[PDB]
Design an enzyme around this catalytic site. Structure first.
Site, PDB file in Angstrom:
ATOM      1  N   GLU A  21     -10.837  29.073 -65.179  1.00  0.00           N
ATOM      2  CA  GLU A  21     -11.535  30.351 -65.116  1.00  0.00           C
ATOM      3  C   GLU A  21     -11.818  30.803 -63.674  1.00  0.00           C
TER       4      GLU A  21
ATOM      5  N   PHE B  92     -25.957  20.299 -74.586  1.00  0.00           N
ATOM      6  CA  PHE B  92     -24.534  20.187 -74.319  1.00  0.00           C
ATOM      7  C   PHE B  92     -24.015  21.460 -73.649  1.00  0.00           C
ATOM      8  N   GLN B  93     -23.310  21.280 -72.520  1.00  0.00           N
ATOM      9  CA  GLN B  93     -22.722  22.368 -71.715  1.00  0.00           C
ATOM     10  C   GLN B  93     -23.765  23.392 -71.267  1.00  0.00           C
TER      11      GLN B  93
ATOM     12  N   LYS C  99     -25.971  31.809 -77.292  1.00  0.00           N
ATOM     13  CA  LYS C  99     -25.191  31.789 -78.524  1.00  0.00           C
ATOM     14  C   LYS C  99     -25.974  32.370 -79.706  1.00  0.00           C
TER      15      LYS C  99
ATOM     16  N   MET D 245      -3.857  27.945 -39.778  1.00  0.00           N
ATOM     17  CA  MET D 245      -5.029  28.488 -39.099  1.00  0.00           C
ATOM     18  C   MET D 245      -5.911  27.376 -38.529  1.00  0.00           C
TER      19      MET D 245
HETATM   20  C1  LIG Z   1     -16.487  17.579 -76.601  1.00  0.00           C
HETATM   21  C2  LIG Z   1     -17.555  16.531 -76.403  1.00  0.00           C
HETATM   22  C3  LIG Z   1     -18.000  15.786 -77.471  1.00  0.00           C
HETATM   23  C4  LIG Z   1     -18.963  14.777 -77.316  1.00  0.00           C
HETATM   24  N1  LIG Z   1     -19.319  14.043 -78.418  1.00  0.00           N
HETATM   25  C5  LIG Z   1     -20.161  13.057 -78.236  1.00  0.00           C
HETATM   26  C6  LIG Z   1     -20.490  12.223 -79.335  1.00  0.00           C
HETATM   27  O1  LIG Z   1     -20.002  12.370 -80.446  1.00  0.00           O
HETATM   28  N2  LIG Z   1     -21.334  11.165 -79.105  1.00  0.00           N
HETATM   29  C7  LIG Z   1     -21.880  10.934 -77.884  1.00  0.00           C
HETATM   30  O2  LIG Z   1     -22.630   9.965 -77.783  1.00  0.00           O
HETATM   31  N3  LIG Z   1     -21.645  11.751 -76.823  1.00  0.00           N
HETATM   32  C8  LIG Z   1     -20.798  12.746 -76.981  1.00  0.00           C
HETATM   33  N4  LIG Z   1     -20.482  13.557 -75.909  1.00  0.00           N
HETATM   34  C9  LIG Z   1     -21.115  13.306 -74.604  1.00  0.00           C
HETATM   35  C10 LIG Z   1     -22.540  13.856 -74.610  1.00  0.00           C
HETATM   36  O3  LIG Z   1     -22.577  15.275 -74.559  1.00  0.00           O
HETATM   37  C11 LIG Z   1     -23.435  13.247 -73.532  1.00  0.00           C
HETATM   38  O4  LIG Z   1     -22.831  13.457 -72.280  1.00  0.00           O
HETATM   39  C12 LIG Z   1     -23.637  11.745 -73.734  1.00  0.00           C
HETATM   40  O5  LIG Z   1     -24.019  11.505 -75.089  1.00  0.00           O
HETATM   41  C13 LIG Z   1     -24.694  11.167 -72.823  1.00  0.00           C
HETATM   42  O6  LIG Z   1     -24.622   9.725 -72.935  1.00  0.00           O
HETATM   43  P1  LIG Z   1     -25.782   8.817 -72.295  1.00  0.00           P
HETATM   44  O7  LIG Z   1     -27.121   9.296 -72.754  1.00  0.00           O
HETATM   45  O8  LIG Z   1     -25.424   7.405 -72.569  1.00  0.00           O
HETATM   46  O9  LIG Z   1     -25.622   9.102 -70.727  1.00  0.00           O
HETATM   47  P2  LIG Z   1     -26.384  10.071 -69.704  1.00  0.00           P
HETATM   48  O10 LIG Z   1     -26.274  11.475 -70.197  1.00  0.00           O
HETATM   49  O11 LIG Z   1     -25.903   9.750 -68.326  1.00  0.00           O
HETATM   50  O12 LIG Z   1     -27.899   9.581 -69.871  1.00  0.00           O
HETATM   51  C14 LIG Z   1     -28.233   8.241 -69.452  1.00  0.00           C
HETATM   52  C15 LIG Z   1     -29.731   8.070 -69.497  1.00  0.00           C
HETATM   53  O13 LIG Z   1     -30.058   6.766 -68.948  1.00  0.00           O
HETATM   54  C16 LIG Z   1     -31.041   6.912 -67.952  1.00  0.00           C
HETATM   55  N5  LIG Z   1     -30.827   5.857 -66.978  1.00  0.00           N
HETATM   56  C17 LIG Z   1     -29.940   5.855 -65.932  1.00  0.00           C
HETATM   57  N6  LIG Z   1     -29.989   4.747 -65.228  1.00  0.00           N
HETATM   58  C18 LIG Z   1     -30.963   3.982 -65.854  1.00  0.00           C
HETATM   59  C19 LIG Z   1     -31.482   2.704 -65.588  1.00  0.00           C
HETATM   60  N7  LIG Z   1     -31.082   1.945 -64.574  1.00  0.00           N
HETATM   61  N8  LIG Z   1     -32.444   2.236 -66.422  1.00  0.00           N
HETATM   62  C20 LIG Z   1     -32.852   3.011 -67.435  1.00  0.00           C
HETATM   63  N9  LIG Z   1     -32.439   4.228 -67.777  1.00  0.00           N
HETATM   64  C21 LIG Z   1     -31.482   4.657 -66.937  1.00  0.00           C
HETATM   65  C22 LIG Z   1     -30.813   8.309 -67.387  1.00  0.00           C
HETATM   66  O14 LIG Z   1     -31.913   8.802 -66.655  1.00  0.00           O
HETATM   67  C23 LIG Z   1     -30.557   9.080 -68.683  1.00  0.00           C
HETATM   68  O15 LIG Z   1     -31.815   9.294 -69.308  1.00  0.00           O
HETATM   69  C24 LIG Z   1     -19.534  14.569 -76.043  1.00  0.00           C
HETATM   70  C25 LIG Z   1     -19.113  15.373 -74.970  1.00  0.00           C
HETATM   71  C26 LIG Z   1     -18.114  16.316 -75.126  1.00  0.00           C
HETATM   72  C27 LIG Z   1     -17.644  17.137 -73.951  1.00  0.00           C
HETATM   73  C1  LIG Z   2      -8.940  34.071 -41.131  1.00  0.00           C
HETATM   74  C2  LIG Z   2      -9.550  35.451 -41.147  1.00  0.00           C
HETATM   75  C3  LIG Z   2      -9.457  36.254 -40.036  1.00  0.00           C
HETATM   76  C4  LIG Z   2      -9.985  37.557 -40.022  1.00  0.00           C
HETATM   77  N1  LIG Z   2      -9.790  38.327 -38.902  1.00  0.00           N
HETATM   78  C5  LIG Z   2     -10.210  39.572 -38.948  1.00  0.00           C
HETATM   79  C6  LIG Z   2      -9.948  40.452 -37.839  1.00  0.00           C
HETATM   80  O1  LIG Z   2      -9.312  40.116 -36.843  1.00  0.00           O
HETATM   81  N2  LIG Z   2     -10.360  41.756 -37.952  1.00  0.00           N
HETATM   82  C7  LIG Z   2     -11.029  42.206 -39.043  1.00  0.00           C
HETATM   83  O2  LIG Z   2     -11.366  43.395 -39.042  1.00  0.00           O
HETATM   84  N3  LIG Z   2     -11.363  41.387 -40.075  1.00  0.00           N
HETATM   85  C8  LIG Z   2     -10.945  40.142 -40.050  1.00  0.00           C
HETATM   86  N4  LIG Z   2     -11.209  39.311 -41.123  1.00  0.00           N
HETATM   87  C9  LIG Z   2     -11.947  39.836 -42.286  1.00  0.00           C
HETATM   88  C10 LIG Z   2     -13.444  39.843 -42.019  1.00  0.00           C
HETATM   89  O3  LIG Z   2     -14.006  38.538 -42.168  1.00  0.00           O
HETATM   90  C11 LIG Z   2     -14.227  40.843 -42.874  1.00  0.00           C
HETATM   91  O4  LIG Z   2     -14.062  40.523 -44.241  1.00  0.00           O
HETATM   92  C12 LIG Z   2     -13.819  42.303 -42.666  1.00  0.00           C
HETATM   93  O5  LIG Z   2     -13.849  42.608 -41.268  1.00  0.00           O
HETATM   94  C13 LIG Z   2     -14.733  43.253 -43.407  1.00  0.00           C
HETATM   95  O6  LIG Z   2     -14.257  44.608 -43.251  1.00  0.00           O
HETATM   96  P1  LIG Z   2     -15.177  45.838 -43.697  1.00  0.00           P
HETATM   97  O7  LIG Z   2     -16.455  45.788 -42.928  1.00  0.00           O
HETATM   98  O8  LIG Z   2     -14.339  47.060 -43.633  1.00  0.00           O
HETATM   99  O9  LIG Z   2     -15.459  45.517 -45.244  1.00  0.00           O
HETATM  100  P2  LIG Z   2     -16.744  44.984 -46.039  1.00  0.00           P
HETATM  101  O10 LIG Z   2     -17.063  43.606 -45.552  1.00  0.00           O
HETATM  102  O11 LIG Z   2     -16.538  45.224 -47.496  1.00  0.00           O
HETATM  103  O12 LIG Z   2     -17.881  45.984 -45.529  1.00  0.00           O
HETATM  104  C14 LIG Z   2     -17.796  47.379 -45.895  1.00  0.00           C
HETATM  105  C15 LIG Z   2     -19.088  48.050 -45.510  1.00  0.00           C
HETATM  106  O13 LIG Z   2     -19.062  49.413 -46.012  1.00  0.00           O
HETATM  107  C16 LIG Z   2     -20.194  49.643 -46.816  1.00  0.00           C
HETATM  108  N5  LIG Z   2     -19.824  50.620 -47.838  1.00  0.00           N
HETATM  109  C17 LIG Z   2     -19.214  50.389 -49.044  1.00  0.00           C
HETATM  110  N6  LIG Z   2     -19.008  51.494 -49.730  1.00  0.00           N
HETATM  111  C18 LIG Z   2     -19.521  52.506 -48.929  1.00  0.00           C
HETATM  112  C19 LIG Z   2     -19.618  53.899 -49.100  1.00  0.00           C
HETATM  113  N7  LIG Z   2     -19.180  54.546 -50.175  1.00  0.00           N
HETATM  114  N8  LIG Z   2     -20.185  54.613 -48.098  1.00  0.00           N
HETATM  115  C20 LIG Z   2     -20.621  53.956 -47.016  1.00  0.00           C
HETATM  116  N9  LIG Z   2     -20.593  52.652 -46.751  1.00  0.00           N
HETATM  117  C21 LIG Z   2     -20.021  51.975 -47.761  1.00  0.00           C
HETATM  118  C22 LIG Z   2     -20.566  48.267 -47.354  1.00  0.00           C
HETATM  119  O14 LIG Z   2     -21.865  48.205 -47.899  1.00  0.00           O
HETATM  120  C23 LIG Z   2     -20.351  47.409 -46.104  1.00  0.00           C
HETATM  121  O15 LIG Z   2     -21.429  47.491 -45.180  1.00  0.00           O
HETATM  122  C24 LIG Z   2     -10.698  38.017 -41.150  1.00  0.00           C
HETATM  123  C25 LIG Z   2     -10.855  37.165 -42.255  1.00  0.00           C
HETATM  124  C26 LIG Z   2     -10.262  35.916 -42.285  1.00  0.00           C
HETATM  125  C27 LIG Z   2     -10.414  35.038 -43.503  1.00  0.00           C
END
Ligand SMILES: Cc1cc2nc3c(=O)[nH]c(=O)nc-3n(C[C@H](O)[C@H](O)[C@H](O)COP(=O)(O)OP(=O)(O)OC[C@H]3O[C@@H](n4cnc5c(N)ncnc54)[C@H](O)[C@@H]3O)c2cc1C
Ligand SMILES: Cc1cc2nc3c(=O)[nH]c(=O)nc-3n(C[C@H](O)[C@H](O)[C@H](O)COP(=O)(O)OP(=O)(O)OC[C@H]3O[C@@H](n4cnc5c(N)ncnc54)[C@H](O)[C@@H]3O)c2cc1C
Ligand SMILES: Cc1ncc(Cn2c(C)c(CCOP(=O)(O)OP(=O)(O)O)sc2=O)c(N)n1
Ligand SMILES: Cc1ncc(Cn2c(C)c(CCOP(=O)(O)OP(=O)(O)O)sc2=O)c(N)n1
Ligand SMILES: CCC/C=C/C=C/C(=O)[C@@H]1C(=O)[C@H](C[C@@](O)(C(=O)O)C(C)C)N(C)C1=O
Ligand SMILES: [Mg+2]
Ligand SMILES: [Mg+2]
Lengths: 576, 590
Positions: free
Chosen positions: A56, A118-119, A168, A496
């Site tokens: 993403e 989770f997540q 959700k 660069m």
């Molecule tokens: C798609 C998916 C499916 C999943 N399905 C499952 C599932 O079916 N079953 C499952 O179990 N998990 C599942 N998980 C994983 C799950 O979401 C959790 O990440 C997991 O259950 C956490 O395991 P845990 O509590 O052992 O570890 P942790 O999340 O790391 O927690 C460990 C705990 O131990 C404590 N701790 C750390 N060190 C010590 C220490 N020295 N002494 C005492 N306490 C300590 C920590 O503070 C924490 O409270 C899934 C994940 C995904 C992505």
């Molecule tokens: C390796 C590298 C080298 C670079 N070398 C150069 C270099 O040599 N020269 C260079 O120029 N740049 C260089 N850059 C790019 C630089 O870092 C800046 O991103 C760039 O200069 C920004 O240009 P800007 O101010 O036009 O755009 P922006 O950063 O987008 O700024 C635009 C400005 O206009 C304002 N604004 C927007 N809409 C309106 C509107 N409708 N009316 C009025 N104001 C508005 C904004 O709020 C902002 O203040 C380089 C980048 C990299 C990664």
């Protein structure tokens, strides 16, 4: 008044309806558990196309290129937890470059928040500093309002990314209730209006005094309705030379005699000369970032001397107040949309002919003769392709269709070379990561760009390290047949940083890009002989569907001119 | 004190790595971190691994930390360098992996000015780290590196982030650098109370999680307790390997995709001994319906929930503990076991007979097996068989989804730290990078990335890293052309409406060929064993593509809304009419 049409619709269904009302035609996203009510609701929708990336982060950078190429906000839909955190980089990227984006992400049910479910991740807490606004939708009844607030915030002022967290229970749940001047307002408005008009009047007086004016235009001009046209009108009427930032490229026609091309640390020597000796600098939608100014205390000495003596200075047309006087003290700050305010400025700027500015343009043409971009070390016929020549030949080969050509790039030496050696003439044609500078941007941004402009030529000019970062998204171009053209500059170095490690203080080995492109189902060719370059490029830009061309370049090629760290803008090192 | 004078912040960093025992660093250069990078790159004191993507750098550091108990160390530049590590950081926070992320920053004078490649990284990463700091002067550099390693490794381990502004790391250093433990009385009192609960238990169950593997001497002590008192043992996903799954007392994994018999036992136990686990929602099912027999026992005074936990905020967060034992589970298990009374298996004939009956009723081996297309459960069973003589030098990293549950269920876990998986955040893409870092940590071990195809697609560019550095991980990509776990959820909850859960897939043979990695592809049941035999016996990195059956459900399943004992189980007839209703809707496409 109240809306009844959502009653009995799930939050997911309301979302699908709000995408309709917001004019969304393309969404980039990846499903998962917490966002499933929304994916079920956009299941097989004929109202917008859905791109499924590999990662993403792909979705986020595709949304940025889509936005960069269209002016519309890119829309992302990801799941909770790691699906949201994977968009953090594109979010910071969009915030740094003012790219409009609405990121929708699943979240665990409201009742589970805080339980380490989770997540679960504190996505509103993580993403606060890297979005312009964010919110957790806390009930299906506030969902349509929040979606509106999000789309408006992303697209107004300076555009930016906005994150909407969708629990959700909010999206799986069913909505069951209907949902939704002054004397002091007129006096506040006139007080603002007087302040703005006085600013523009003083800006015009300053411009009218100036004997060596320069327009320093940036991305704000391109993001403004009528901005490029107004800029041309102003530059033509007063015969002012125009330089752009990297993001302003294409805002002004670089074949116009008044074009100074790009300024900055890697800009044209003559653009920098102009800015260092101008007595009036007109900064239009640009922000004085440090790649442009060099050491700030040395920036624009003649503009500062002029301000000091009452006969010029620095004019700054800026929509975002936080960016006024952040880095450089403006002599006159004209707040608000640069298009609207140039409309009020131009009729008060007095006309001037090129002949009136003979001495100024003579100095400029002198600098152009002495420091032409086109002078660099070219390949011997038995060497490897020079990277500058790749950009030159892409520009020549697209000269007759610049109005439909979009360049996206990686980050590094190649990003500067295309800025220097391609001739920019179309607004929104430069699609590149500037403020954050995210290697990996190019390929996914190009894909989103081609999605926004299916009838345009879109090229990703990508350095090899940058392209190694997100190369998995070639599968996205292939699965969906998104006809991006990819140019991978294979020099086997992080050019660069090795340029920096060679100036201030050292390199990775690549996959086989023909085999890889074969694995991904992409047309592919390789080219290392200088004599073969042009024809290789003709093959690339005439293919149907997605294609990739590897260009084996040599290593340790300088980016010139360069203004090194610690130097002023006029202290550049050019090629000898 | 006074020993660091004259050195640059980079050189000082270089030495704090030595004083912290760091032998392996994962990272990626940039302008803002070049001072640190110049220092430690080229050094003969560290192995520096340079991946393709800083996300790879982070997951690598995670897998290195899972396989070694040592903290993973990440060094990246500012801005996009640091934000690309945010998912590894959150992932490590959620699974308690020790990690120290060092990232460049713009010079302190430039902070807050939207300088080039500047982000509010301490602001962005506050919510997803144990702790974070910006280093404001060369003099506080040693103290802050020390604190960071201290916090990442103490308590529940986790990730810390250290912001290194470019002038701090280029600058030169010019300076130099009553109580009464009645708590012991109370800990001891509550250890004694816990022993009294275990001793009175008629149906005890040990619920073991990752804290046991994270506690020094943890698995040894868990086995001594379980053996002495004849207590059946179940583990979480992360706990797989804390207990010998071949031991007759092993209940295997509990939870949403746990063994039916582990779930049954948890729901009927009268004393649940929770060792270093946290009552995750993937474990408990509907919490109000979780552990009825132990809540009933706790009310009557004859049992309950004993929770051995090191993090107080995690005690009583989800389940009321009848007796909480705070602190390190291993240290506290040394004090518990002598107070627990020895009992044989036969003393517990009734309890183990109930468990054995659950095992015959719901064996993990009862899934659809005639020899047309390969079944993913058999792939996991054969990996277990083919490494049976080396489970102690075998490490399994996984993606996220059906394959991850299948290997949890059908591989027999026996080695602590052998299970290397993202469970808390659940980050697809984790496998290959984590396997690379684990194999960096365990160069002489056999390290396998059991990866689904969508997971693998996320981060497959890191194959180049295995090739370049010759890191000999073995990759098994399960090719089903779907986001398997999500199609299950849409089949279950959404009438086979498969909204964007199918992906093309690159040619993995060409892809591996492109990356300079030896490779085979197997699609026939008869050839599966030989394919995996070839893979585990290669030298250097290798990749095997297993083309598998599509739309295979992960069973058993405790679905949303169900108590831990209200699971689904494989039914051959429901499965062949599930495939059939799926075909009418999808109009012959699935
Ligand atoms: C798609 C998916 C499916 C999943 N399905 C499952 C599932 O079916 N079953 C499952 O179990 N998990 C599942 N998980 C994983 C799950 O979401 C959790 O990440 C997991 O259950 C956490 O395991 P845990 O509590 O052992 O570890 P942790 O999340 O790391 O927690 C460990 C705990 O131990 C404590 N701790 C750390 N060190 C010590 C220490 N020295 N002494 C005492 N306490 C300590 C920590 O503070 C924490 O409270 C899934 C994940 C995904 C992505
Ligand atoms: C390796 C590298 C080298 C670079 N070398 C150069 C270099 O040599 N020269 C260079 O120029 N740049 C260089 N850059 C790019 C630089 O870092 C800046 O991103 C760039 O200069 C920004 O240009 P800007 O101010 O036009 O755009 P922006 O950063 O987008 O700024 C635009 C400005 O206009 C304002 N604004 C927007 N809409 C309106 C509107 N409708 N009316 C009025 N104001 C508005 C904004 O709020 C902002 O203040 C380089 C980048 C990299 C990664
Ligand atoms: C995601 C990320 N990580 C690290 C950096 C630091 N960095 C790096 C590592 C560069 C080298 C780019 O190499 P390339 O092959 O993509 O292009 P060139 O060889 O033409 O420089 S440029 C640069 O700013 C970055 N910009 N982005
Ligand atoms: C980075 C990320 N994005 C999205 C998800 C949501 N998600 C997705 C999309 C899954 C499908 C994984 O498919 P797979 O090919 O990797 O493996 P299986 O086919 O065996 O499920 S599982 C899961 O939790 C996730 N966990 N992580
Ligand atoms: C939190 C991340 C982990 C997610 C795992 C997947 C869970 C689910 O997939 C289901 C699901 O998604 C249904 C919703 C619903 O729409 C349905 O029709 O079934 C209903 C409430 C209208 N619920 C409530 C779930 O938990
Ligand atoms: Mg390169
Ligand atoms: Mg799959």
């Amino acid at each position: 008044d109240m809306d009844e049409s959502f009653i009995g619709k799930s939050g997911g269904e309301i979302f699908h309806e709000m995408m309709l009302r917001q004019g969304v035609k393309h969404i980039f996203g990846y499903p998962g558990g917490a966002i499933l009510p929304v994916f079920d609701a956009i299941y097989n929708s004929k109202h917008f196309d859905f791109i499924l990336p590999r990662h993403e982060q792909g979705a986020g950078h595709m949304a940025e290129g889509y936005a960069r190429a269209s002016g519309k906000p890119g829309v992302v839909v990801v799941t909770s937890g790691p699906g949201a955190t994977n968009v953090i980089t594109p979010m910071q990227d969009a915030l740094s470059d003012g790219t409009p984006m609405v990121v929708f992400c699943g979240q665990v049910p409201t009742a589970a928040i805080g339980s380490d479910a989770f997540q679960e991740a504190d996505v509103v807490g993580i993403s606060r500093a890297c979005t312009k606004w964010n919110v957790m939708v806390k009930s299906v009844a506030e969902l349509p309002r929040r979606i509106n607030e999000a789309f408006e915030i992303a697209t107004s002022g300076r555009p930016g990314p906005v994150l909407v967290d969708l629990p959700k229970d909010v999206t799986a749940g069913i909505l069951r209730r209907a949902i939704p001047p002054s004397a002091a307002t007129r006096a506040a408005k006139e007080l603002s209006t007087q302040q703005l008009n006085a600013s523009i009047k003083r800006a015009a007086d300053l411009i009218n005094m100036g004997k060596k004016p320069v327009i320093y235009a940036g991305q704000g001009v391109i993001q403004s309705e009528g901005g490029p046209e107004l800029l041309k009108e102003l530059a033509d009427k007063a015969s002012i030379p125009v330089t752009t930032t990297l993001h302003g490229l294409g805002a002004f026609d670089e074949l116009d005699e008044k074009s100074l091309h790009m300024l900055g640390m890697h800009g044209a020597a003559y653009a920098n000369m102009a800015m260092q000796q101008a007595d009036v600098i007109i900064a239009l939608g640009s922000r004085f970032d440090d790649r442009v100014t060099g050491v700030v205390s040395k920036f624009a000495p003649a503009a500062r001397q002029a301000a000091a003596e009452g006969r010029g200075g620095i004019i700054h047309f800026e929509i975002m107040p936080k960016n006024i006087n952040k880095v450089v003290q403006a002599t006159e700050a004209v707040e608000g949309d640069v298009g609207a305010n140039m409309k009020l400025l131009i009729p008060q700027v007095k006309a001037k002919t090129m002949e009136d500015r003979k001495e100024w343009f003579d100095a400029i043409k002198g600098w152009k003769k002495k420091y032409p971009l086109s002078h660099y070390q070219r390949a011997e016929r038995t060497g490897l392709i020079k990277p500058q020549t790749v950009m030159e030949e892409i520009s020549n080969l697209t000269a007759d269709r610049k109005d439909k050509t979009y360049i996206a790039t990686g980050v590094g030496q190649h990003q500067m070379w295309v800025a220097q050696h391609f001739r920019w003439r179309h607004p929104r044609s430069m699609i590149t990561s500037g403020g954050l500078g995210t290697m990996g941007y190019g390929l996914p941004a190009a894909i989103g760009a081609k999605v926004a402009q299916p009838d345009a030529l879109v090229i990703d000019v990508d350095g090899d390290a940058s392209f190694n970062m997100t190369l998995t998204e070639l599968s996205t171009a292939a699965q969906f047949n998104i006809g991006v053209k990819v140019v991978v500059l294979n020099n086997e170095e992080q050019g660069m940083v090795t340029q920096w490690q060679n100036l201030f203080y050292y390199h990775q080995r690549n996959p086989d890009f023909m085999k890889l492109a074969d694995a991904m189902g992409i047309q592919h060719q390789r080219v290392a002989e200088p004599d073969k370059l042009v024809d290789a490029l003709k093959w690339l830009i005439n293919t149907d569907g997605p294609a990739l061309l590897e260009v084996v370049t040599d290593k340790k090629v300088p980016v010139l001119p360069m203004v090194p760290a610690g130097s002023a803008l006029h202290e550049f090192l050019v090629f000898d």
